[PDB]
Amino acid sequence: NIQGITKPAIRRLARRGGVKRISGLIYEETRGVLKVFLENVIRDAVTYTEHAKRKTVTAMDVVYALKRQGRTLYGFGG
Amino acid sequence: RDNIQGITKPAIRRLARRGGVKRISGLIYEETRGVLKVFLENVIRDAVTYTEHAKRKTVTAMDVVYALKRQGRTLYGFGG
Amino acid sequence: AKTRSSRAGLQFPVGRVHRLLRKGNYSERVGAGAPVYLAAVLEYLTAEILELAGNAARDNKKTRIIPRHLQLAIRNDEELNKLLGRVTIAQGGVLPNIQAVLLPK
Amino acid sequence: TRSSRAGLQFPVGRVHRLLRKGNYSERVGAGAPVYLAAVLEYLTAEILELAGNAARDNKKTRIIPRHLQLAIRNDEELNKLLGRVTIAQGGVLPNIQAVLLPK
Amino acid sequence: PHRYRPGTVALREIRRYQKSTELLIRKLPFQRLVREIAQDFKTDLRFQSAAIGALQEASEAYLVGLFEDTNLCAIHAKRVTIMPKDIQLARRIRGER
Amino acid sequence: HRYRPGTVALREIRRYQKSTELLIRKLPFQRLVREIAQDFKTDLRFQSAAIGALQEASEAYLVGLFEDTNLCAIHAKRVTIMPKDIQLARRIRGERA
Amino acid sequence: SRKESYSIYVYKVLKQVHPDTGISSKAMGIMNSFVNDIFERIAGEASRLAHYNKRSTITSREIQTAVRLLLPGELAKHAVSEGTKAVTKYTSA
Amino acid sequence: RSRKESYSIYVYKVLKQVHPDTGISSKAMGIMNSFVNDIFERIAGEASRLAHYNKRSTITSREIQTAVRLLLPGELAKHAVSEGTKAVTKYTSAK
DNA sequence: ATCAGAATCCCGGTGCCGAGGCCGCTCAATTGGTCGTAGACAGCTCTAGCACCGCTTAAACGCACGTACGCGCTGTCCCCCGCGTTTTAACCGCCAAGG
DNA sequence: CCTTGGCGGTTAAAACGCGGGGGACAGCGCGTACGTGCGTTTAAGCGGTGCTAGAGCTGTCTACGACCAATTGAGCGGCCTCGGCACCGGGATTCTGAT
Numbered sequence: 006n007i008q009g010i011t012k013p014a015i016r017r018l019a020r021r022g023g024v025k026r027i028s029g030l031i032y033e034e035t036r037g038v039l040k041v042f043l044e045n046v047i048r049d050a051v052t053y054t055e056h057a058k059r060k061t062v063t064a065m066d067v068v069y070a071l072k073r074q075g076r077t078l079y080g081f082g083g
Numbered sequence: 084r085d086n087i088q089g090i091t092k093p094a095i096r097r098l099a100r101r102g103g104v105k106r107i108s109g110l111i112y113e114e115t116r117g118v119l120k121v122f123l124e125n126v127i128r129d130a131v132t133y134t135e136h137a138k139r140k141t142v143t144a145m146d147v148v149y150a151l152k153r154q155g156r157t158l159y160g161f162g163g
Numbered sequence: 164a165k166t167r168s169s170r171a172g173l174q175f176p177v178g179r180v181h182r183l184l185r186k187g188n189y190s191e192r193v194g195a196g197a198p199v200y201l202a203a204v205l206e207y208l209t210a211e212i213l214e215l216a217g218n219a220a221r222d223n224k225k226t227r228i229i230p231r232h233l234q235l236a237i238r239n240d241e242e243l244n245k246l247l248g249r250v251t252i253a254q255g256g257v258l259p260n261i262q263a264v265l266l267p268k
Numbered sequence: 269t270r271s272s273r274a275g276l277q278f279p280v281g282r283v284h285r286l287l288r289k290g291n292y293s294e295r296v297g298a299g300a301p302v303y304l305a306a307v308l309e310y311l312t313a314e315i316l317e318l319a320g321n322a323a324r325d326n327k328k329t330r331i332i333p334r335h336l337q338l339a340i341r342n343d344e345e346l347n348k349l350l351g352r353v354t355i356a357q358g359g360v361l362p363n364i365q366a367v368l369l370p371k
Numbered sequence: 372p373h374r375y376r377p378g379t380v381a382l383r384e385i386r387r388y389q390k391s392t393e394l395l396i397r398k399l400p401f402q403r404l405v406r407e408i409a410q411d412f413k414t415d416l417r418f419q420s421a422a423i424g425a426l427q428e429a430s431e432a433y434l435v436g437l438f439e440d441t442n443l444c445a446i447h448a449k450r451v452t453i454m455p456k457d458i459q460l461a462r463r464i465r466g467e468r
Numbered sequence: 469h470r471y472r473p474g475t476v477a478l479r480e481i482r483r484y485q486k487s488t489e490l491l492i493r494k495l496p497f498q499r500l501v502r503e504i505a506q507d508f509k510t511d512l513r514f515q516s517a518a519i520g521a522l523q524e525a526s527e528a529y530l531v532g533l534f535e536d537t538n539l540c541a542i543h544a545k546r547v548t549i550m551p552k553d554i555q556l557a558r559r560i561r562g563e564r565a
Numbered sequence: 566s567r568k569e570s571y572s573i574y575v576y577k578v579l580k581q582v583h584p585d586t587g588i589s590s591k592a593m594g595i596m597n598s599f600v601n602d603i604f605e606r607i608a609g610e611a612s613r614l615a616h617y618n619k620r621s622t623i624t625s626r627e628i629q630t631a632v633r634l635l636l637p638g639e640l641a642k643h644a645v646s647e648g649t650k651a652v653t654k655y656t657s658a
Numbered sequence: 659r660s661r662k663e664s665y666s667i668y669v670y671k672v673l674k675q676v677h678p679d680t681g682i683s684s685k686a687m688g689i690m691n692s693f694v695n696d697i698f699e700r701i702a703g704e705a706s707r708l709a710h711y712n713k714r715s716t717i718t719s720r721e722i723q724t725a726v727r728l729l730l731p732g733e734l735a736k737h738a739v740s741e742g743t744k745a746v747t748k749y750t751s752a753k
Numbered sequence: 754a755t756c757a758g759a760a761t762c763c764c765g766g767t768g769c770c771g772a773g774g775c776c777g778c779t780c781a782a783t784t785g786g787t788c789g790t791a792g793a794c795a796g797c798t799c800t801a802g803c804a805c806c807g808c809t810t811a812a813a814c815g816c817a818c819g820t821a822c823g824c825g826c827t828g829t830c831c832c833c834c835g836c837g838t839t840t841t842a843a844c845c846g847c848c849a850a851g852g
Numbered sequence: 853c854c855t856t857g858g859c860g861g862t863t864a865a866a867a868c869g870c871g872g873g874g875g876a877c878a879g880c881g882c883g884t885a886c887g888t889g890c891g892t893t894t895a896a897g898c899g900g901t902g903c904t905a906g907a908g909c910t911g912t913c914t915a916c917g918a919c920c921a922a923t924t925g926a927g928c929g930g931c932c933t934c935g936g937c938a939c940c941g942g943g944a945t946t947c948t949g950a951t
Contacts, residue, residue, distance in 0.1 A: 012867085024538040025478065027549055043522070047508070062514060067522060073634070079356065086400060098434050101257060102438025160253040201604065209596065226586070230591050282927095284782095304742075307726055336689060359487070369478070448545065464560040566909090
């Protein structure tokens, strides 16, 4: 379910981001922020797909949604 | 000369009070004037480029409006 | 009902919206149903701002609407603020806000 | 082709046709697509030179998107131009705060 | 007639300015600053009054917003006084350079 | 034997700084995407490239968020990051309304 | 010159919004700019959706989905309802 | 089976010109092709806005000049203007 | 300070599969000619951007005085990290509808 | 033809427990710099008064860009070889860890 974003995963992401030591209460807030960001991006993607009356959402629609969010992604048919 | 210093200390104090700053250091004013300077520089650079593209030499309000729109600081009520 | 707005029962001009859409270079052709929808959306948004602006003016016990009241209406409502956080209203001022720590005890 | 005759590489004809297909103007000038092709060529040349230097840093011959990421994030103006855009399989620059290092 | 504890004047002026909707910086120094800072882009430029007004509005809004951000940064460290380091932190988080 | 706290963490910071592989597990992220898109539209077919782009974008977003979080924590004379740091960083970023 | 405005339209909306609430000219101009920006953004989203799906025409569906994309949930739903109602009673009339 | 058009070979030629020996991966090539598409979109949109603001419909090279000067930061814009002006003069010299 | 000891990059040997090079094939770039109008340019108007001067008083500014945070130091507590240990399901790989 | 569903092996990784000292809290001990009021100086603001450069509107003739029809070659689909990084084992410094 929602527990797939594990403690070592968030720890690895924080280590890559330059954080030295992380408190134990960071994980839940990180999960919530990830959930809301995914909700926004995937909502835009599914609306883009539904406008075309399709059922399979493409990475092209995801890239368009990210463009709408101002965080464009390269290398995915942009 | 030094018209950036024309933005006196009480003006920056009033702006901070409008923002809601309770205690102000004595050297905040220099950094505030510098950030004002850089924002003025970028906005007026965009506006002057826009005005020059129109082949006019009068900085109009709509030029600043479009410059801010590019910069993401859109303004209403001044046309556009 | 001769004007397209009158047939559509809309205050905003359907014909003017259609003309702007045609001479705005958005597509090769413009469907006739799009201007009605766009005029209705514009009318509804202007209203939704207007009622809150009127309530803000009423709270300030002022007969007329001032752009300060417009800024108040935009800021207080969460959805309007979400929409127009990137817009600064002329002579709109800021909301009355004081941090709890800054308040004397 | 118009590209070789103008001392450039990118296709002027494809640029002009896609300008038509984008409805960027009712009618499009002749010299504007040539300038657009030249600007695109210069931008790509700078990006590719930076990518080659980054590959030479790692003693590598093939361009990995990590090299592009490092090249974009090291140059100032290009990083400003492409700062809001994230690159897949690129990573971030190596930066550890001077306060986090041990005594 | 008496001097009270420092800070109450700060509260009163913050409340009055927040209730206010005016332009705090004088018009002539700002217009002169605009002329000086635009002389390096194109000389003999003639500045419309509405252009100066829009520039004043935008500048005051940006400075005020930087001021709420700097105040938030200062109170983030259990502090009341604002330091320039708060200003650079606010600009760094904002994504503006 | 035993290593002192904060040293192996720094070594992991070094190692994770050079790698570019996706740090999230694939199938848990696929399940998360399906369970978060189920409420919007029903019986949604997903492309592999779509969820891969989602993974990369979310990873970059979280990396930037953690950078801002560490910056906020260190601005207040602190080494460990607190959730209030994330809250303040997102509020200043403009994502929090 | 002959300059257009949405002044009378906003005035008509205001009369049915509040019969006894006047407005200043500065607020009227701010509202005009607001309407211009909203029209530009919705029409731009519709144009992007049309070009991105290989359609050279802009119809009610594109505007509706653009409104859904732009406005927040409750506001998007209510604006969609208003637009659909207006289009339906225009087609009927 | 439709035909998908890209800029792979042109960028490959540019890279070979600026680097005698440099390999290029498919992922990096796609990233930079999408980047070229993004720059194309940015310049085209800026030129369209500039043309509309002056109430024109013919986008000359001057509109692209001002679009590049507004978009590209400083020295990048100046170098692009110099290279493009030289290329335009080269094109106008011949057919 | 100075010795003990794992970690990991450079070095050498494996190796395999996508990139570079090439070939074949086709529809969009290139060229000539035509015509229609967008605008480049000449030209008049009159608007407002600007320069100057005189009052005129609101606003900034220097300074004395005071105490309210800023910053540091010292103590106390605690809770992620790092170690080892136990479980576990994701990934690889294979294999099939089927929409 | 690309997405989804099922199944089997396994090992790399996720999940658990516990010792511990470094970091997060608090609570003083002062130091001084900013907050505030009081004059004192100043410069912004306002009211005329010209002054004149340049934005704006008007018309006219043009010459370039949207159209047509030939034509041909350079870019995309398809195919084949290699080396350069994916990978695995050794070697020695580079740090920390301990005293």
